Symmetry: none
Subunit: 148 residues, 4 copies
């Protein structure tokens, strides 16, 4: 239901941090999570002093191109998520623990030749949105419904 | 319906440009417009070669603290908006045209002067502000359009 | 008490970004603040998402050569500092709010023709330390005493 | 005598840090610097790259199995030869001024998983400080109080 309105602004905000295909994919994923009601908390599997509840990409989010570990919390709630994006050659393995998983090929969704051009960075973005929603977002929301 | 998800990112993206209460109010207004299906094109009354379709605040948006003139194009196709935010004492008069919805907002009730550049303390009565902008600006434009279509 | 050990490393962590006398003076002041128990938080009057507790100079610290506004927080989080370095002609006025005021003539402390050389950049450094400590550090600490 | 400056030093060193030993030597270097010594260079004897500085000396990490670093007292002539010797998952530290020795398990102080990330690189850092001080720094300082 929700738009991805804000992705262009987020992408521009992360321009100096986006150096590889994985950075661009994680940027997109982050905004999918935010637009579905979550706020970023920080990086790593545990709270640090740098933790801030925010829409922005957490400081240090892009410091490991092989493994992205980002924590989230429901906007006006206490519900928490641990999101991992794991690089495996030209693919990323996405998984979330509140354990939904999803494997994406970077070549299918990111154009490496145009990382500096937002309008040509993402390919098949509508399909990317649906796979992230059905593979990541929806399972989380349904686990929420069952336990009430 | 739509949220204001992205306002925090927008505000951060424009923080150096935000030097007065009016800048902060217009920033808020801009995102209300974008989240309701529009893209920013540019500034002033006149379309020109420096127009660029974007979610970002257009270059020069904050140059006149007395009169903000922003143009928008619907993300889908060629529908258009001309937004004017007019500073009057401690208030701003908003008028929008594609036909002209008019809304007056007291800055004292929506912007904290003391903590201006602090995002989480900049805006007061945000939910009322959203409601009034949607009721006063967004919905009338949409409905007059539906009547015309 | 505390030495200024780390100043050279800090300066080296800034030299490609240091472009004028004021940058070098602010870098020195920053280390006086850090070595006396504070962490750099960010720049400007207001907190932002770019805020980060660090010994390092905050991102954007030298954006404005006329006015440096830096925020600090004590290492335990008990107190905060708003530090302003104001360029006035050949001098800088330093005021810190937790108002401590101190005026430094750049001609007497910074060598403008060797800004890329750490060992020739600073002059009368012992006097500089002493004046910053007695003018800024100590009275800030003692304003914290009376609370 | 704080370890203020360690974060700044680490940032300067991180692009060249590729193993656990690199990170431990960086920490040891700052312990030595903050206790009054400046680095001079590498190897048993002075080389053309010698330079009295707080910074990690040129070529400090060319050999991951054996780190050989020379120091000299700040504003003084007293010299130290520090060796860090890799033995599997441990390092043997000794100082020549002969005088000091200390064995450290890397598993105990360096997180392999988070090496390039400062705040998660060092484990049990307070214990590390105390052992380096008692094992290395103090005997040196005690040496300087006899004969």
């Amino acid at each position: 239901s929700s738009p991805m309105a804000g992705l262009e602004v987020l992408f521009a905000s992360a321009a100096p941090a986006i150096t590889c295909r994985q950075d661009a994919l994680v940027c997109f994923l982050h905004w999918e999570v935010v637009t579905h009601g979550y706020c970023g908390l920080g990086v790593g599997d545990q709270p640090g002093p740098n933790d801030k509840k925010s829409e922005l990409l957490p400081a240090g989010w892009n410091n490991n191109k092989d493994l992205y570990v980002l924590r989230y919390e429901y906007k006006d709630g206490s519900r928490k998520l641990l999101v991992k994006a794991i690089t495996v050659e030209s693919s990323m393995i996405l998984n979330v623990l509140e354990v939904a998983d999803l494997t994406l090929n970077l070549d299918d969704y990111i154009d490496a030749e145009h990382l500096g051009d937002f309008h040509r960075t993402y390919k098949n973005s509508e399909e990317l949105r649906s796979r992230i929603v059905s593979g990541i977002i929806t399972p989380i929301h349904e686990q929420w419904e069952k336990a009430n």
